[PDB]
Structure formats: structure tokens, C-alpha cells
Ligand binder design. Structure first.
Ligand code: CHL
Ligand code: CHL
Ligand code: CLA
Ligand code: CLA
Ligand code: CLA
Ligand code: CLA
Ligand code: CLA
Ligand code: CLA
Ligand SMILES: CC1=C[C@H](O)CC(C)(C)[C@H]1/C=C/C(C)=C/C=C/C(C)=C/C=C/C=C(C)/C=C/C=C(C)/C=C/C1=C(C)C[C@H](O)CC1(C)C
Ligand SMILES: CC1=C[C@H](O)CC(C)(C)[C@H]1/C=C/C(C)=C/C=C/C(C)=C/C=C/C=C(C)/C=C/C=C(C)/C=C/C1=C(C)C[C@H](O)CC1(C)C
Lengths: 215, 170, 33, 223, 220
């Protein structure tokens, strides 16, 4: 499964474009609007999908972890909630990593922005061209210096890991979209919503307190 | 007169159709300024999406028009329809149950539909009048899309029923 | 032969040793920007 | 600094060798190799997007001066518009008691109905845009749907080939800058709701206090 | 994946190849290559150990099911007999063994009679099992008799039979591990496993195994 012509499709037994031939990882044969009818556009879309998957996985982990730490009494952050965490730079003492005044103590947003722009641009350019960490051969799966533990050694294991990565990234993207729209609707933390729903699932949900107020 | 070079375009006397819009499919009015349907497969997918959107916009326009008009002739507003369930039909005597039932039935019917797909006929129903009715369906669908867009934008900006806004014009 | 990668190691994953550093000294990592 | 051929300037400088698509050969003006989403794989799509981009560039290039110049005119005391010197409130003067008049002088226009101007504009565009779509009309053009020349070039600057290419490159670059600036005008009016010159003066007063990050908690969801 | 041959799954993942004994050639169900003490280097002892392991695994699944089910059915009422280790003395009570709560099913009062009946019946059963032949027609294999104990014919295809053997040795090993856990939990915390799970789910940070760690400390 997951490869060739007999892989699982996106509709199970109820299921296809000719260009989805079951070769690339994470191919469930879901292209209804036909945006990937061009091989070059298909390659570009695959690359953007992989990059977005990795970024969304990182973002979901970084949105969950600080609030989980704060609510368990493991640390005292300036602003545990993910969408309120960007205003810590405007507080009295600035931004302190994990609440320790001796860890980062960032104070200026201009310096943060300049350093981030420079470093991100440099590493981005290295990714698309090749630099200190290696030379580009596979635009999205470099390996070598980015696979120190050698988990993607066997080609079969490499394909399995690619499928697992793309699926966990798709789930992360969906959950990130959920985080955004919940924050824009409820206005509270994600784990806070989870705890509230777990306290009273029957009465605490989107419909009972927000469906009627939306319109 | 809707097929071939003598077709009516979206600009009238100005006849500059694209190369790929060679008046074969219904409603080929030669409107592609962004070149979004150069690829034939993309054109086929766009045609299917447009037809499905047309039918759904037809149904939505009718289902939004009926309640308030029935109210005047004896919440009624189109967007304040799902709030009543917190729902007796025509005023004549659990969200999860309806949600799962609708989801499973819709999944079943659409999986059956996926597995001429665009124009099946038979169980749901001279080729000249057939093509005439296809063109008429496409025009009524485009009108339905425009009407639904206008209805939604008015609900956002006026917070009142569309027929109420029409009566206030008048 | 499992649980790791087989993989001279310099101070950068992709860099060249300088001409004057031939790698004979003990701690020679080819580091002299 | 060549802007054509295989050794032109690209969109990432030194880091741009392994990013230029194979279908962007630097033949058309304004090419820099920036195509990462693959939106112009088909040549017909590329031509259509080129046309859309140049028309958008021209429109925004005009719109920048349109939104700016009344404010500079009012700032120097050469005229008086009230509150219409800004771009996002110029359409409200038509509902005023005096109405809307060019340069603030009642003897110039003195228009007080919006249906007449809207209708005249509708006819004007319905003629001119359709003529552009047609590609030919009562005027003399050089048989180019994008650079008609001839009648559309009264001074005839675009006669030499190299001069024409340089002029095209300058047009497309100034249009890209103008679209960027117009996007900035739109967002800055949406967020702070103040005049762009007011924003510039406020930033020039206290650069470290009145910047973009000052209005960061403005759009904060509440419980 | 694979559970037979030299390319089967093993007990140490990538590190397995350095500790695979020669005599463990993967010709039996549940072969993962785990023998670091060489206790089965003798072919006869290997067969005896396989027999003991399979019988123990079967008894382990039976014990786990019989320790889990009665607590869930309490649809009934037992009180102090709900716990698996607290139901042993329910016979001694002057109420009978109220199966499912009805005091009319077995009404067990004396332990000597039930003890003797169990001894005689299981002596007969286990002696027949050791002999392997008698009133019941089997396939001839002591470990996998079939014939009478297989009234559904699920073991007819040799490959399907091997797959089921592997599946059931694995389920029995899991039940073995869980039964050892049940025993140790009963000795340590003195609470029913369902109560232990509920307490763990209540606050997992402090209701873990290390909370009851100093209770065994030998005071002077
Ligand atoms: C060597 C370094 C170098 C680097 C790193 C870049 C990088 C870039 N150039 Mg290039 N250039 C470089 C050299 C050169 N450029 C050019 C000529 C050009 C031109 C003519 C153009 C570019 C453009 C661009 C941009 C293309 C990608 C993108 O749109 O934004 C990259 C950004 C991201 C993907 C994400 C944004 C990051 C940002 C910091 C976000 C921060 C977030 C906020 C603080 C808060 C957000 C709030 C929430 C609610 C949203 C990008 C900034 C194009 C452009 O996009 O202009 C606008 C453009 O038109 N370059 C020349 C002349 C030959 C160069 C000389 O070497
Ligand atoms: C699989 C083997 C087997 C095992 C491991 C046990 C294990 C146990 N039995 Mg059981 N029995 C077993 C088979 C049999 N038992 C009995 C009949 C009894 C009786 C009559 C009693 C036990 C009781 C006990 C428990 C003694 C310790 C105690 O304080 O409980 C913790 C409970 C407290 C209330 C403190 C102990 C958990 C005794 C008991 O204490 O149970 C409550 C009890 O009196 N067993 C029979 C005869 C049918 C068996 C047949 O093989
Ligand atoms: C996708 C990228 C990503 C991004 C942009 C952020 C962004 C942010 N994080 Mg999050 N985070 C992420 C992923 C990400 N995180 C992941 C994967 C984890 C789990 C390891 C966390 C766990 C986390 C913690 C525990 C904390 C943050 C905090 C913050 C802030 C950084 C302050 C700082 O001093 O960093 C500068 C960092 C470095 C110089 C290197 C540190 C590397 C460590 C030692 C490892 C900023 C709002 C801080 C905060 O304000 O929370 C409210 C904070 O204390 N994050
Ligand atoms: C047709 C009438 C209609 C009307 C009057 C409204 C009214 C409202 N909507 Mg709703 N909405 C509608 C239809 C409508 N909606 C539809 C068809 C959808 C798509 C499912 C939504 C989805 C929606 C979202 C995603 C949001 C709103 C929001 C809002 C509020 C925006 C003001 C603000 O948040 O500050 C406003 C009260 C905002 C809100 O969450 O409620 C305050 C918000 O951001 N609406
Ligand atoms: C499909 C046909 C259709 C029809 C018959 C109507 C009919 C009506 N519209 Mg709606 N409208 C439509 C589509 C349509 N609209 C669309 C596509 C939009 C933009 C998405 C709007 C946006 C709109 C606005 C903003 C307003 C109306 C209003 C009105 C009234 C007359 C003013 C007018 O239309 O111009 C005004 C708007 C347009 C340019 C169209 C009348 C009840 C008025 C109202 O609701 O109160 C009476 C009003 O102020 N309409
Ligand atoms: C490209 C499109 C464009 C557009 C749509 C507008 C739009 C507008 N202009 Mg602007 N303007 C433009 C370009 C443009 N301008 C340019 C290139 C200049 C010269 C640099 C000006 C300089 C200008 C002046 C001096 C005045 C306007 C004013 C006006 C308003 C109506 C003018 C009128 O009475 O009838 C025509 C209207 C908001 C008038 C006004 O109402 O001021 C707010 C006014 O007096 N404009
Ligand atoms: C073409 C050049 C250009 C220039 C010179 C300016 C200049 C200015 N901007 Mg504008 N802006 C632009 C384009 C430009 N903008 C674009 C494209 C956007 C959309 C991303 C914005 C969105 C914007 C916001 C949201 C705000 C400003 C504001 C301001 C002022 C402070 C800059 C700042 O803090 O934010 C830095 C600028 C950006 C957010 C992104 C642009 C990237 C730069 C050019 C690099 C300054 C007068 C601020 C203000 O009003 O000051 C009082 C402010 O609130 N700008
Ligand atoms: C097969 C799976 C298994 C599972 C799911 C559980 C599950 C549970 N055990 Mg049990 N346990 C097991 C086997 C298992 N056990 C075995 C084999 C032993 C003997 C070594 C024990 C001995 C044991 C003790 C002594 C205690 C628990 C307790 C608990 C609970 C807390 C977990 C923890 O902190 O200790 C897990 C620690 C272990 C020693 C078990 C082995 C770890 C493997 C990976 C499982 C949890 C409901 C705790 C509890 O009841 O407190 C509320 C506790 O006090 N268990
Ligand atoms: C052509 C072309 C070409 C070139 O090339 C380019 C361009 C130009 C871009 C293009 C264009 C396009 C366009 C314009 C489009 C549009 C669309 C639309 C509007 C749609 C709608 C669409 C719409 C739709 C579907 C709608 C639907 C609806 C519905 C279902 C409804 C429902 C309902 C009902 C019953 C009632 C209630 O009470 C409510 C509800 C429940 C809600
Ligand atoms: C390149 C690439 C590549 C890859 O592959 C992909 C991607 C990324 C997608 C791409 C990108 C893109 C982009 C960036 C775009 C942008 C655009 C814009 C910004 C526009 C504007 C645009 C803009 C514009 C037109 C503007 C215009 C304006 C105007 C007219 C104005 C007007 C006016 C005036 C005068 C004045 C008054 O009082 C008001 C008004 C009336 C209002």
C-alpha cells in the first residue's frame, strides 16, 4: 500500500487523475479542481506542501508546549497563550525565556526583527542554493548533514518515513488552522478550550455558546 | 446560435475569443482574460465545478427566498435559520445526531456520484432541446451565483433580509 | 553497523581545508577564517 | 547590469542560481526569475499574467499620484479640500452640502449627483476597455495589444529598440514599486485609519515610538 | 511483517543480529531470538519450555479476562467480592457464591467438596493432556490438539494456522505481562486494577508507581 497503482485513495472504497500515478509520497488521489495538471506546477506544489507541513508541525508544537508547561505549574511565562506571547516584548522587563531573567532578557523588537531577517534570509538562500551545511541535490530531502542519525538509510524505510512525515504534517496543518480560527472565535488558549470541553463535553462546545452569536 | 463563431460573447461586437475557447462547450462566451483554462484537464474540472456550483446556488437561492416570502404571505431571515434549533417544520410540532446523519448520507450519495458523470440522466430524469436546456441551466446557475453573492454581501452589511431591503428600495 | 550513520570532519559540514593547514597537527579541524 | 539574457540580475542575488525556472529565460522586460509557485507554466498563462501585471502597474502608478498630490497641494496652502485630501475620504465630498468641486473652487465642477458621474464612467470604460480588448479601433496603433505606440506615443520616445527596452524595464519596475506602495497605503488606512502623510510625520517625529509595532495589540480577540 | 525465516522481526530491532543464538532459526511461532542465558540450547528442553510457555500464556489470558470481567459487571452487586484477589474468601461468607448476584445459581457453602471435585476433574484432564490420547479424537499434536477443541474449523490452512499461532502466542505473552503487573500491583498498593487506573487518570503526575516507593523502607 501507499505506493503503486493499488494504494489507498482518499475516498476508500468509493473512489482518479491520470497524473497521480502513485509514485510520490502521500498520494491519496485527491485532486478535484485540477490545480496539479502540470508536472512543473505539481513539483512546486509538492515542495510547498512539504515545507508547509514541517513549518506547521513546528508551529503546533511551539503553540502547545509553553501553555502546557505554564498550566501544570512548571514555569511562569510572561504570556503563556500563543497569540498573546508576542506582546511580552512590551512588558516591563522584556522577554525572558521560561521566565528566568537571566536566560534571554530580550528588550528591543527592532533588534529582534533585524537579526531574524538576516539569519532567515541567509539560511533560506542556503536552502535554495547550497552553503555551509551542504550542497543542494534534493530540494526538500537533503540528508547527509541533516540526517546525522542515519534513519533514512534504507530506501524502503526512507519511503515509509516520507509518508509518515507528510501525513503528520497534514494533520499539523489542519490543527493549526483550527488553532487560528478558535483563537479568532473563542479568544482563549487551545489547551484551555480542551480542558473546558473535557470538564463538560455536553454543554461546552462551539455550538452551545458560539454558533448563535456568529450571525 | 450559441455554438460556433456566431455565439454571443461577453463583449458583443468586440470579437476576440481565446484559442482554446472554440465554441464547443455550452455557454462558451469566450471569457478567459486570466488564461485559467489553458490546460484541457483544468477546463474540464472547472466546467464540472461551475455546473455543481450552479445547481447548488439555484437550490440555495430558492431556499433563502422561500421563508421570508412565506412569512409575509402568512427566525424568518435566511442567515438566522440554524439558530432556531437551540426546530419545528413550518411551525408545526440533539445537534450531534443530525450532524452525523447528514454527514453519512451526504458521503454516501457523493461517493456514489464519484463512483457521463457530469450529465448522468436516466434515474434523475431530441438532443437539440436538451442542449438548449443545458444552456438555460448554465445561465440560470450563473444568475443564481450572482444573486447569492449579492444576498450574502447584503446580509453582512445591512443585517436585514434581502426581500426586506428590496421592499425598503421600493 | 546499525543505530547510527557511517559518515575527515571539518568545522563546517561543507567546507574545504585551508592550504596551510594540512591536517597533521593534533587538533587540526581546518578552522582559520 | 544586464536585464536580459542568461546573466541578468535575479530575485535572490547570489543565492538565486538554483531557483530560476527553466521557462523564464529573461526574454521579456521585468524578468527576475521569481516563480516558486509555478503559476505561469503554460506560455499562454505567462502572457496573460504579463498583461495583467503591466495594466495593474500602470493603474497603481497613476493611483499613487492620485492619492498623494491633493494632500501636498493642501499642505502648501495652494488649495482647500477640508477632509478630502486623504485617499479614503475623497469619495465623501460628493455627499456634502457644497458638493465636490475640483481644486476646491466652486466654478470648476460643482457636482452633487453620483449617478451621472458613475454612468459617464461606465460608458467611458465600456468603450475604452472593449477597444483595448479588440486590439484595433479608430486610432493608429503599431499592431501591438500591449504597446500600441503611434497615437499612444505623441512624443515618440519609444522608437529605438534598446531605448524601448530600457523604457519598458523602467515602466515595469516603477509599476511594481507603485503597487507595493499602494498596498502599503491600503493596509496603513485599514489599520491606523490616518493619512499617509500623517503617518510619515508621526514616524519622523519619534521613530522608535510611532512605528508599525505600536499598533500591534489593536486587533486582539476578546473573551 | 515477517515472523518466520532469517528475515523475521526480532527482539532488539537493529541490534538483534549480534545476539541471535544459532539454535533460534525462526521455525516456531513467537520466535524473536531472545535467549541471552542459553536456557534452551538443548533441543528437548526447548520443546518443554515451549509447551510450558504456551500453556502458561493460555492460562494468563484466561486469568486476565476473569480478573477484568467481574468488576465491569458490578449489572450486578458483590461489594467486597468485586476485586479479583478479594473474591477468594467470598465462599466462606454465610451467603453462598451469588453468581451474578442471584442467590440461587450455585449457592456454594463448603470448600472441601468444590476443592475435591476440582482436583479430580483437573487430574483427569491434565493426565489425558499428558498422555495425549483417549476418548477425544485430536490431530495428534499435544500443543495444538484440534479436532474436538476446534469446532469451527478456523485451523485448516497451514499458513493461516501459523499466523494464528503467532498472533496467539503474542496475545498470551501480553496477558502474561499484564498478569504479572496485576500481581505486583496487588501486593504493592492493595487496590483493584480498575481503581488504580482511575487514580492514575485522575492526576498522572503524582499518582504513579513512584509515589508508593518509601512504603517498603525497612525501619530500624
Ligand atoms: C542576498 C540576499 C537577498 C535576499 C535574502 C533576498 C530576498 C528577497 N528578495 Mg531579493 N534578496 C536578496 C538579494 C537581492 N534581491 C534583489 C532584487 C529583488 C527584487 C527586485 C525583488 C526581490 C524580492 C525579494 C523577496 C522574495 C521572497 C518574498 O517575497 O519575501 C520573503 C519573505 C517571507 C517568505 C516571509 C516574510 C518574513 C517577514 C520577516 C515576516 C515577519 C512577520 C512580522 C514581523 C509580523 C507578522 C504578523 C502576522 C499577523 C502576519 C525576498 C525578501 C521581491 C519582493 O518580494 O519584494 C517585495 C522583489 O520584487 N529582490 C537584488 C537586486 C539584483 C539583490 C542583490 O543581491
Ligand atoms: C491461580 C492460583 C491461585 C492464586 C494465585 C490465588 C490467590 C489468592 N487466593 Mg485463591 N488463588 C488461587 C487459586 C485458588 N484459590 C482458592 C480459594 C481461595 C480461598 C478460600 C481464599 C483464597 C484467597 C486468596 C488470596 C490470599 C491472600 C489475600 O490476603 O487476599 C487479599 C484479600 C484480602 C481480603 C485482604 C490470594 C490472592 C483468600 C483470601 O484472602 O481472599 C480474600 C481466601 O480466603 N483463595 C481455590 C479453591 C477453589 C483455588 C483453586 O486453585
Ligand atoms: C516554529 C518555530 C517556533 C517559533 C517561531 C517559536 C517562537 C517562540 N517561542 Mg516557542 N517552541 C517551539 C517552536 C517555536 N517557538 C518548540 C518546537 C518548542 C518546544 C521545544 C517551543 C517551546 C517554547 C518555550 C519553552 C518557550 C518558547 C518561547 C517562544 C518565544 C521565543 C523566545 C526566545 O527566547 O527564543 C530564543 C531561543 C533561542 C536563543 C534558542 C533556545 C533553544 C532551547 C534552549 C532548546 C517565541 C514567541 C518562550 C516564551 O515566551 O513562551 C511563552 C519560551 O519560554 N517556546
Ligand atoms: C448574512 C449575514 C451575516 C451576518 C449579519 C453576520 C454577522 C457577523 N459575523 Mg458572521 N458569517 C456569515 C454570515 C453573517 N455573519 C457567514 C455566511 C459565515 C460563513 C460561515 C460567517 C462567518 C463568520 C466568521 C468566521 C466571523 C463572523 C463574524 C461576524 C461579526 C463580524 C464583526 C466582528 O467580528 O467585529 C458579525 C456580527 C466574526 C465573529 O466571529 O463573530 C463576532 C468572524 O470573524 N462571521
Ligand atoms: C442579482 C441581482 C441583484 C438585485 C436584483 C439586487 C437588488 C437590490 N440591491 Mg443588491 N447586490 C447584488 C445583487 C443584486 N441586488 C450584488 C451582486 C451586490 C454586490 C455583492 C449587491 C450589493 C448591494 C448593496 C451594497 C445594496 C444593495 C441594495 C439593493 C437594492 C437596490 C440598490 C442596488 O442594487 O445597487 C446598490 C449595489 C450594487 C452595486 C449592486 C435592491 C433591493 C441596497 C440595499 O440593500 O438596501 C436597499 C444596497 O445599498 N445591493
Ligand atoms: C488615476 C486616477 C485618478 C483618479 C481616479 C483620481 C480621482 C480623484 N481626483 Mg485625483 N489626480 C490624479 C489621478 C487620479 N485622481 C493625478 C495624476 C493628479 C495630478 C498629480 C491628480 C490630482 C488631483 C487634484 C488636483 C484634484 C483631484 C481630485 C480628484 C477627485 C475628483 C476630481 C474631479 O473633480 O473630477 C475630475 C477624485 C477623488 C479633486 C478633489 O476632489 O480633490 C480631493 C482635485 O481637486 N486629483
Ligand atoms: C514602499 C515602501 C513603504 C514604506 C517606505 C513604508 C513606510 C511606512 N510605513 Mg508602510 N507598508 C508598506 C509599504 C511601505 N511603508 C507595505 C507593503 C505594507 C504591507 C505589508 C505596509 C504596512 C504598514 C503598517 C501595518 C504600518 C506601516 C507604517 C509605516 C511607517 C513605519 C514603518 C513600520 O513601522 O512598519 C514597517 C513596514 C511594514 C509592515 C512592511 C513593509 C516592508 C518595509 C518597506 C521593509 C512608515 C511611514 C506604520 C505606521 O503607520 O507608522 C505610523 C504601520 O503601522 N506600514
Ligand atoms: C502491560 C502494561 C502495564 C500497564 C499498562 C500498567 C499500568 C499501570 N500500572 Mg502496572 N505493572 C506492570 C504492567 C503494566 N502496568 C508490570 C509488569 C508490573 C510489575 C513490574 C507493574 C507494577 C505496577 C506498580 C508497582 C504500580 C503500577 C501502577 C500502574 C499505573 C501507573 C503507571 C506507573 O506509574 O507505573 C508503571 C511502572 C511499572 C513498574 C510497570 C512496567 C513498565 C512497562 C513499560 C509497562 C498504571 C495504571 C502504579 C499504580 O497503581 O499507582 C497508582 C503502581 O504503583 N504497576
Ligand atoms: C469567469 C472568469 C473567467 C476569467 O478567466 C477569470 C475570472 C474573471 C476570475 C472568472 C470569474 C469568476 C467568477 C466571477 C466567479 C463567481 C462565482 C460565484 C459568485 C459563485 C457563487 C456561488 C454560490 C453558491 C454555490 C451558493 C450556495 C448557497 C447555498 C448552498 C445555500 C444554502 C442554504 C440554504 C438553502 C438556505 C439557508 O437559509 C442557508 C443555507 C443553509 C446556507
Ligand atoms: C511574483 C510571484 C511569484 C510566485 O511564483 C507567485 C506569487 C508569490 C503569488 C507572485 C507574487 C505576486 C504578488 C506579490 C502580487 C502583488 C500584487 C499587488 C500588491 C498589486 C497591487 C495593485 C494595486 C493597484 C492596482 C492599485 C490601484 C489604485 C488605484 C486605481 C487608486 C485609485 C484612487 C485614486 C487615484 C485616488 C482616490 O482618492 C481613491 C481611488 C479612487 C481609490
Amino acid at each position: 500500500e501507499f505506493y503503486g497503482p493499488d494504494r489507498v485513495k482518499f475516498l476508500g472504497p468509493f473512489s482518479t487523475p491520470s497524473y497521480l500515478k502513485g509514485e510520490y509520497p502521500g498520494d491519496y488521489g485527491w485532486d478535484t479542481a485540477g490545480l496539479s495538471a502540470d508536472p512543473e506546477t505539481f513539483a512546486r506544489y509538492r515542495e510547498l506542501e512539504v515545507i508547509h507541513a514541517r513549518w506547521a508541525m513546528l508551529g503546533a508544537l511551539g503553540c502547545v508546549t509553553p501553555e502546557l508547561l505554564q498550566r501544570n505549574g512548571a514555569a511562569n511565562f510572561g504570556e503563556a497563550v500563543w497569540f498573546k506571547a508576542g506582546a511580552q516584548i512590551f512588558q516591563e522587563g522584556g522577554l525572558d525565556y521560561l521566565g528566568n531573567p537571566n536566560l534571554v532578557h530580550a528588550q528591543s523588537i527592532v533588534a529582534i526583527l533585524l537579526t531574524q531577517v538576516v539569519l532567515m534570509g541567509l539560511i533560506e538562500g542556503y536552502r535554495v542554493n547550497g552553503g555551509p551545511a551542504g550542497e543542494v541535490v534534493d530540494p526538500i530531502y537533503p540528508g547527509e548533514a541533516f540526517d546525522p542519525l542515519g534513519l533514512a538509510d534504507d530506501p524502503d524505510t526512507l519511503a515509509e518515513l516520507k509518508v509518515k512525515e507528510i501525513k503528520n504534517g497534514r494533520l499539523a496543518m489542519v490543527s493549526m488552522f483550527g488553532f487560528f480560527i478558535q483563537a479568532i472565535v473563542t479568544g482563549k488558549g487551545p489547551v484551555q478550550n480542551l480542558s473546558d470541553h473535557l470538564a463538560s463535553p455536553s454543554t461546552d462546545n462551539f455550538y452551545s455558546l458560539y454558533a448563535k452569536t456568529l450571525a | 446560435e450559441w455554438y460556433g463563431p456566431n455565439r454571443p460573447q461577453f463583449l458583443g461586437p468586440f470579437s476576440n475569443p481565446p484559442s482554446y475557447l472554440k465554441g464547443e462547450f455550452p455557454g462558451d462566451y469566450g471569457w478567459d482574460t486570466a488564461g485559467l483554462s489553458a490546460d484541457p484537464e483544468t477546463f474540464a474540472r472547472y466546467r464540472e465545478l461551475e455546473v455543481i456550483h450552479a445547481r447548488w446556488a439555484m437550490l440555495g437561492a430558492l431556499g433563502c427566498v422561500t421563508p421570508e416570502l412565506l412569512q409575509r404571505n402568512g427566525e424568518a431571515v435566511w442567515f438566522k435559520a440554524g439558530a432556531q434549533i437551540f426546530l419545528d417544520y413550518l411551525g408545526n410540532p440533539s445537534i450531534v445526531a443530525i450532524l452525523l446523519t447528514q454527514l453519512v448520507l451526504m458521503g454516501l450519495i457523493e461517493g456514489y456520484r464519484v463512483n457521463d458523470a457530469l450529465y448522468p440522466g436516466e434515474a434523475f430524469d431530441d438532443p437539440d432541446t436538451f442542449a438548449e436546456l443545458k444552456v438555460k441551466e448554465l445561465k440560470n446557475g450563473r444568475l443564481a451565483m450572482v444573486s447569492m453573492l449579492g444576498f450574502g454581501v447584503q446580509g453582512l452589511i445591512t443585517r436585514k433580509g434581502p426581500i426586506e431591503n428590496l421592499a425598503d428600495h421600493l | 553497523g546499525a543505530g547510527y550513520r557511517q559518515y575527515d570532519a571539518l568545522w563546517l559540514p561543507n567546507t574545504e581545508r585551508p592550504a596551510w593547514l594540512d591536517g597533521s597537527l593534533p587538533g587540526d579541524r581546518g578552522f582559520d577564517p | 547590469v544586464e536585464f536580459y539574457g542568461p546573466d541578468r540580475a535575479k530575485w535572490l542575488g547570489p543565492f538565486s542560481e538554483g531557483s530560476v525556472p527553466s521557462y523564464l529565460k529573461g526574454e521579456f522586460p521585468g524578468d527576475y526569475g521569481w516563480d516558486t509557485a509555478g503559476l505561469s507554466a503554460d506560455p499562454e498563462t505567462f502572457a496573460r499574467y504579463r498583461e495583467i501585471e503591466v495594466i495593474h502597474a500602470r493603474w497603481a502608478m497613476l493611483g499613487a499620484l492620485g492619492c498623494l498630490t491633493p494632500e501636498l497641494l493642501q499642505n502648501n496652502g495652494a488649495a482647500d479640500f477640508g477632509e478630502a485630501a486623504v485617499w479614503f475620504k475623497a469619495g465623501a465630498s460628493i455627499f456634502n452640502e457644497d458638493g465636490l468641486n475640483y481644486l476646491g473652487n466652486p466654478s470648476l465642477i460643482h457636482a452633487q449627483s453620483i449617478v451621472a458621474v458613475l454612468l459617464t464612467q461606465l460608458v467611458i470604460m465600456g468603450a475604452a476597455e472593449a477597444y483595448r480588448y479588440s486590439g484595433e479601433g479608430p486610432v493608429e496603433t503599431s499592431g501591438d495589444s500591449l504597446y500600441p505606440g503611434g497615437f499612444f506615443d505623441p512624443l515618440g520616445l519609444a522608437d529605438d529598440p534598446d531605448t524601448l527596452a530600457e523604457l519598458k524595464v523602467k515602466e515595469i519596475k516603477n509599476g511594481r514599486l507603485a503597487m507595493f506602495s499602494m498596498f502599503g497605503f491600503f493596509v496603513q488606512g485599514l489599520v491606523t485609519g490616518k493619512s499617509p502623510l500623517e503617518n510619515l510625520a508621526d514616524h519622523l517625529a519619534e521613530p522608535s515610538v510611532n512605528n508599525g509595532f505600536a499598533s500591534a495589540t489593536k486587533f486582539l480577540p476578546l473573551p
